[PDB]
Write a protein that binds this DNA or RNA. Structure first.
Ligand SMILES: [Mn+2]
Ligand SMILES: [Mn+2]
Ligand SMILES: [Mn+2]
Ligand SMILES: [Mn+2]
Lengths: 373, 373
RNA sequence: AAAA
């Protein structure tokens, strides 16, 4: 038997348990059992598994044990804890009461309070960790978690590249130098990307010689701006080799530049964020349900930020696009992540219509529009 | 001399406090003092205001009092309670520890436990209320809240219109008799409703005679089915009078029939639902942000149900429509309401594509499709 | 902060 046991209560929010266990283990540096006190409801949602997989401890140090209580029955939980610590003698007992129902938390606290060789902790959301007993004091959780740990703790599998077509020195100026004065030309390329033929050919080939393509395909686009001459012209404004155009170059022009700009700006200028915890164009998946997130990052307070980028949302069409994006962003973050997340919408346009502003305010979506970017 | 005082802890979920207070006031039916223990964070979110407005007790029965604690400081809540209750002579101190942080709840329990004039309660979500002290007892919270009380507890105003164009006997067969064989005709009327003129004329008036409209108004819709002859036909298949067409007759054909079917099915066949707590064609509003909800109801266990109706989601367009509807429904219910809500999508179509099925399952959206309707 |  190990000399130390870490007692945690399992509930919907896995992060307070992952954060505490990782912090305590790396302070303590000793073999231990981690006891997860769970329920039938939480085991159906695999919460104990998500906790274990986020921590990925080796078998040399850590033993796991999951026991089950009725989360709403204070006597059954008191009895289970009482019998457990009669049957198993530990020299150091560490209890995190942050998780569970209030019934589970109350039973644990009332059982462990004032006992010898016992320490009791509670983590308020967004604050320093507290020791409640035996010595009241606070501990800073600064930089404890990584982005991967946060996603693992939610049972979310993911894939990202952080591949950028242009570097930060270029994207810092691409709006002024290439985008702002060529908006009409860009609408053509947007049409080009959504055109039938061009989309299908890029499923089979990696690049395309734009000079070698027939003008019938450019007129089949149906757009005033989308001529063979203009597409060659805007491709060269952005520095691409018109003889070897791959799809990501088109996507860069049609709005990928703003995703890269936001991603690199965070990596280079946001003081409460480390580069290493920032991700661009992430695919997340859970229960075979897939979503694409433009930019996400974990800040140094271990809080997740999720950004949807919309380069421009001007017009009657841009307002419908913006409205749809507010719902989609809100649904994803409320459904895939726990409490400790902030959602943002970034755009170059200036948002002044009452409907998106009031919706974002009600939703808690932080809007960062042209006035600040 | 209030011989009874209720004490409640204020947190994000207002329903457990509103439900408990209404239940207890209805049980004892004597004047009482009601103490709210709140925090600066919850007052910023107006949570005690929502609780009191939902209950709208008369000054002649209830004295509301409010004291303030730190949500994360166990000794602060103990001290706040100690000072307020010192030397008290209440006959009955009724303590609801369901709300607050675990720190608040714990502090409250430890303060009131084992006292001679206290009773301590905890409400597990979706279960029987529990008395914890001095006896272990359970109570059913059946039919405690009204739909209006639930929405007031969230600070939400709403309007609705329960008038149905057709009765339940007609709506039980309208799909087979009128819809299934005229989908293309109805697609014409769907195009009619979106047309700028037809939408405009009905904003400046109420009644339109369809015989006196020029054909050029219909050809201007640009739908192969939206002729003058075809629309008159479908208006007659549903049994209306072409001289006096209201926007509601049109809305009935374009999908209102299915909303009415769902609404009437709830009122006529859902045994755990009181018809007075069901609402059709709802507009909810908070912070000047409005949402249209097809059908909502509070069931007899005080749980809110929110329904989006989509008559048909067949085809490429239908799946994009259905996808947008899932995000919109999820965004609204996760943002506007607390934990105690269930969201549903009702459709006549059969949903079997993997993407919507897995999205709905991850979101917890209950799909009632044609296999059940 | 009805299962940070
Ligand atoms: Mn985007
Ligand atoms: Mn004092
Ligand atoms: Mn029943
Ligand atoms: Mn609908």
């Amino acid at each position: 038997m190990k000399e130390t046991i870490l007692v945690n209560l399992v509930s919907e929010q896995t992060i307070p348990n992952v954060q505490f266990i990782k912090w305590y283990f790396n302070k303590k540096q000793t073999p231990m059992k981690i006891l997860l006190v769970s329920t039938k409801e939480m085991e159906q949602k695999e919460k104990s598994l998500f906790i274990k997989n986020a921590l990925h401890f080796s078998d040399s140090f850590v033993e796991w044990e999951t026991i089950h209580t009725d989360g709403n029955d204070i006597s059954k939980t008191e009895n289970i804890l009482t019998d457990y610590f009669r049957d198993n003698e530990y020299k150091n007992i560490i209890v995190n009461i942050t998780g569970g129902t209030k019934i589970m938390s109350l039973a644990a606290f009332d059982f462990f309070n004032n006992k010898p060789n016992t320490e009791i902790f509670y983590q308020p959301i967004g604050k320093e960790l507290q020791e409640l007993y035996p010595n009241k004091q606070k501990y800073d959780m600064f930089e404890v978690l990584s982005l991967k740990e946060y996603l693992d703790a939610h049972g979310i599998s993911y894939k990202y590249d952080n591949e950028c077509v242009k570097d930060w020195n270029y994207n810092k100026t691409v709006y002024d130098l290439c985008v702002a004065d060529n908006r009409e030309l860009i609408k053509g390329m947007i049409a080009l990307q959504n055109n039938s033929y061009f989309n299908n050919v890029y499923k089979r080939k990696d690049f395309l010689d734009f000079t070698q393509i027939e003008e019938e395909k450019f007129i089949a686009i149906n757009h005033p701006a989308a001529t063979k001459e203009n597409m060659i012209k805007i491709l060269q404004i952005f520095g691409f080799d018109v003889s070897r155009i791959e799809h990501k170059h088109i996507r860069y022009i049609t709005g990928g530049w703003f995703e890269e700009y936001v991603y690199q700006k965070i990596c280079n200028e946001y003081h409460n964020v480390d580069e290493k915890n920032v991700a661009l164009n992430v695919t997340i998946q859970k229960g075979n349900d897939k979503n694409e997130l433009n930019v996400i990052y974990l800040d140094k307070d271990n809080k997740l930020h999720v950004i949807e980028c919309k380069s421009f949302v001007d017009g009657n069409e841009g307002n419908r696009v913006l409205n749809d994006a507010l719902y989609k962003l809100q649904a994803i973050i409320k459904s895939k992540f726990g409490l400790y997340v902030k959602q943002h919408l970034y755009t170059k346009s200036i948002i002044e219509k009452e409907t998106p502003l009031n919706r974002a305010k009600e939703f808690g979506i932080d809007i960062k529009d042209g006035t600040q970017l």
